[PDB]
A paper describes a structure:
Our previous efforts to develop a far-red FP with improved performance relative to other FPs yielded the small Ultra-Red FP (smURFP), which we created from the α-allophycocyanin phycobiliprotein through 12 rounds of directed evolution. Unlike α-allophycocyanin phycobiliprotein which requires a lyase to attach the chromophore, smURFP formed a covalent bond with BV via a cysteine residue without needing a lyase. Furthermore, smURFP is small (16 kD) relative to the GFP (27 kD), and yet its molecular brightness is equivalent to the enhanced GFP (eGFP) with a fluorescence quantum yield (QY) of 18% and a large extinction coefficient (EC) of 180,000 M−1 cm−1 at 642 nm1,11,12. smURFP was successfully incorporated into genetically encoded far-red and near-IR ubiquitination-based cell cycle indicator (FUCCI)11 and Förster resonance energy transfer (FRET) kinase sensor. The structure reveals that smURFP is a homodimer, and polar, π-π, and hydrophobic interactions mediate dimer formation.
On the other hand, apo-smURFP crystallized from a solution of smURFP with 20% BV attached, enabling us to determine the structure at 2.8 Å resolution. We observed that the asymmetric unit contains a hexamer with three smURFP homodimers. Each smURFP monomer comprises six alpha helixes (h1-h6) connected by loops. Two monomers form a dimer through hydrogen bonds and polar, π-π, and hydrophobic interactions at the dimeric interface. The interface is also stabilized by two salt bridges between h2 and h3 (K18, K19 to D55 and D23 to R54) and a π-π interaction between F65 of h3 from each monomer. Hydrophobic interactions also contribute to the interface, most notably L68 of h3 and I78 of h4 of the counterpart. In our structure, we observed that C52 is located at the edge of h3 within a pocket that binds and subsequently covalently attaches BV. Importantly, the smURFP chromophore pocket is formed by amino acids from both protomers, which agreed with our previous directed evolution studies that indicated that the dimer was required for BV incorporation. Whereas allophycocyanin hexamer is composed of three heterodimers of αβ subunits that partially overlap side-by-side to form a hollow disc, the three homodimers of smURFP form a smaller pinwheel-like structure. The comparison of the chromophore pockets revealed that the pocket in the smURFP Y56F mutant was larger at 663 Å3 with disordered loops compared to smURFP, which forms a smaller pocket (576 Å3) with a compact and rigid secondary structure.
Numbering used by the authors:
A (entry chain A): 3 to 136
B (entry chain B): 5 to 88, 92 to 135
């Protein structure tokens, strides 16, 4: 329900796969322990599950931005956070770092007003992820 | 009120729903995983799984919001970008996604949820 938010959602929808690929490669360059033996992205099936989870988080951010509401993050977003922590064994700082890389890869396609409008959604998901053990 | 519970159910089981739907679709259309198909190689299968997941997530979000506007908004955008992957395979994939999703609901939940799958299938049939 906004012109600029519709344009940003369009950009994030056209480039969802490229954004996820760039963000994941950045994250695995920065954090070599994730693709090391014992890491959450060592094997191929684990890597595919990580890519699908990062994609889900990007989609949720894009939907919340298109809507203009951050409610869905506190609703179904926490369910996905808990599922990624529990089922995939992803430590909280790895989830935050993945969302941060997703944020930077997404804002690399926008300008300045768009990036300022978009960043609070990534930031809110990061905040929801960091207060998990509380 | 109920839609938050339905969206929670589809989010807790997003991976299982997508897996069941994709396996059902590939049993139904064996040409998809045959040589030349869009799900033949392993990377092809991963990309197909991510696309089906995106469609399921859009449906789940439209159900959580109660609005189908985003379908006419970014759904057609993604369809056009992904095609320029054949379009008529997407239809049956959404049908399988719907069946796998409704297998987890009852009767009121399924009756409330199915119209979103129906709308995305109908919007996807008007593509040229
Ligand atoms: Cl901690
Ligand atoms: Cl940051």
């Amino acid at each position: 329900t906004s012109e600029q938010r519709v344009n940003i959602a369009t950009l994030l929808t056209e480039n969802k796969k490229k954004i996820v690929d760039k963000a994941s490669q950045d994250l695995w360059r920065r954090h070599p322990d994730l693709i090391a033996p014992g890491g959450i992205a060592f094997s191929q099936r684990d890597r595919a599950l990580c890519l699908r989870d990062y994609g889900w988080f990007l989609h949720l951010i894009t939907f919340c931005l298109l809507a203009g509401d951050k409610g869905p993050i506190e609703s179904i977003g926490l369910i996905s956070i808990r599922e990624m922590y529990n089922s995939l064994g992803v430590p909280v700082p790895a989830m935050m770092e993945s969302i941060r890389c997703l944020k930077e890869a997404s804002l690399s396609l926008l300008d300045e007003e768009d990036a300022n409008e978009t960043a609070p959604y990534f930031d809110y998901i990061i905040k929801a992820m960091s207060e998990f053990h509380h």
